[PDB]
Amino acid sequence: MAPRGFSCLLLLTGEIDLPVKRRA
Numbered sequence: 001m002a003p004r005g006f007s008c009l010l011l012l013t014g015e016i017d018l019p020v021k022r023r024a
Contacts, residue, residue: 002010
């Protein structure tokens with residue numbers, strides 16, 4: 001269960017909390 005709110009929320013909730021993606 002993740003509506004449009006879960007996206008716009010996660011997009012901001014999860015940004016600089018993942019050092020695994022160091023290719024971008």
